[PDB]
Chain A
Amino acid sequence: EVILVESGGGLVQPGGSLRLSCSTSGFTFTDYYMSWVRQPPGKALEWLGFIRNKPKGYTTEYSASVKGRFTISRDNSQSILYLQMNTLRAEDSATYYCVRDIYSFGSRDGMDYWGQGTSVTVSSAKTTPPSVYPLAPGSAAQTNSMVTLGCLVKGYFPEPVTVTWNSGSLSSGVHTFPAVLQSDLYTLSSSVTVPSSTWPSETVTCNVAHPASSTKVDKKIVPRDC
């Protein structure tokens, strides 16, 4: 199984620099060209550059957009790909993807494997951890059967924040709304719906993660809101 995992993302001040890493496993790293592709929130994918494979001598090439500012390198003994990003500016804020490219021209083509990507935000604003508030129904049941609960994640920076419910167990029935940036701080909420015979008799917890401030919060939803 091919595995690509990016790390290194976070908040960088304008003019700052950052080094991203991509760990790889499951294939012979040196036989492949490797590329970096980025994507600003809500925008198109953008190819940044690649580093060729062993037969081609591992030579590098870059997009005009970052050539002279970003460089790519690879550690062939550890099978790790890097992206050195210098003199950053707002426009560089994006999710950065590590991607396996071709291994030969006549065989096939296409970027067949992609990592999950790592987010980078270029801003002068301060990293701020979130406050996680549990949202339980007010003292008013009404037509029961299914119950909806939620959790409000407020006042954090930069994006993103990851929200799961029972460590992912509660997938489906879950809706996480897009964060809204206010001033220099984001707020979002998440809702989960489960049968009333599940909650509160059984536990429901929302798990929030904010990579940038290396924070992880678990908030159990306890009855008696209002």
Chain B
Amino acid sequence: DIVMSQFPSSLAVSAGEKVTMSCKSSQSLLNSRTRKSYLAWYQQKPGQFPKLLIYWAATRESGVPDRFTGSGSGTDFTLTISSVQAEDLAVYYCKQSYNLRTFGGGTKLEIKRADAAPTVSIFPPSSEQLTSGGASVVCFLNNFYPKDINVKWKIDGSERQNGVLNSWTDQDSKDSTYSMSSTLTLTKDEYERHNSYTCEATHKTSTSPIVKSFNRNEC
């Protein structure tokens, strides 16, 4: 069998910059008669199916932007993207078709962009959820960058760090920003024995946290 590998595992550049990534095979993919190397490149944007970009090592699929160029032969290959665009955010995979087919492990291309502050929204538990005996307080932190962000929850002025779960979206394909949800889940009983619920977001873009809260008693 042939082992396919790629490097680096991940790379980051700003829009407009050029990027190169590599692919290597355990054995030569060159056919001595045809002189071609049977290597292809695929692009898989976050959440969608893969798209064929290049085949036979250097032939671009019709319709694929000329910014994408493949090169190499034998066991060593490269994919170059000149003038990277925000939408180029994706994992790129190489694949040999010399003997059956085998995919490499992929190279994730991340995009760097200007810092942006998050937009914070807080939501008290729905009446529906209360009927099930549970209570989730949710805070969305949308369209920010960089990814690193801290959320602090406070109930009646006290910090609550138990029962809190955070979840980040993949980078956006159009504006390269991130979004994240912070959810504090309590039982209906505990939720009802407190008044103030606050989520505080601390991000690089400011020295002062963005705070959102409601009182429940003012509900």
Contact = CB atoms under 8 A, between A and B. Distances in A.
B97 interface: yes
Contacts, number: 143
Given A138-B123, A139-B218, A180-B165, A191 B106 contact: no
B126 A176 contact: no
A225 B124 contact: yes
Interface string B181-219: 101000000000000000000000000000000101011
Interface of B: 1, 34, 38, 40, 42, 44, 49-52, 54-56, 59, 61, 93, 95, 97, 100-106, 119, 121-129, 132, 134, 136, 138, 140, 142, 165, 167-169, 179-181, 183, 214, 216, 218-219
A93 to B, nearest CB: 18
A112 B41 CA distance: 11
Contacts of B34: 106
Given A47-B95, A177-B181, A111 B52 contact: yes
A47 B100 contact: yes
Nearest to A106: B34
Interface stretch (A14-22, A84-92, A128-136, A207-215): A128-136
A61 B126 CA distance: 53
Contacts of B97: 102, 109-110
Interface string A73-89: 00000000000000000
Give the 10 A-B CB pairs with smallest separation, nearest first. A226-B219, A110-B55, A226-B124, A133-B126, A138-B214, A47-B101, A109-B55, A135-B123, A148-B121, A175-B179
A213 B49 CA distance: 24
B121 A191 contact: yes
Given A45-B42, A152-B138, A177-B181, 8 more contacts: A45-B106, A47-B102, A47-B103, A49-B100, A111-B95, A178-B168, A189-B138, A191-B140
6 contacts: A108-B55, A109-B38, A111-B52, A175-B142, A180-B167, A189-B138
A193 B142 contact: yes
A188 interface: yes
B136 A45 contact: no
A225 B137 CA distance: 12
Contact of A148 (B128, B142, B214, B218): B142
Contacts of A188: 167
A191 B218 contact: no
B100 A50 contact: yes
A50 B97 CA distance: 12
A177 B167 contact: yes
B115 to A, nearest CB: 19
Contact of B61 (A110, A133, A175): A110
A47 B181 CA distance: 35
Contacts of A63: 100, 102
B179 to A, nearest CB: 4
A30 interface: no
A37 B42 CA distance: 13
A150 interface: yes
Given A137-B121, A148-B121, A191 B181 contact: yes
Contacts of A177: 167-169, 179-181
B53 to A, nearest CB: 9
A131 B132 contact: yes
A176 B181 CA distance: 9
A189 B179 CA distance: 12
A35 B52 CA distance: 14
A20 to B, nearest CB: 15
Contacts of B125: 133
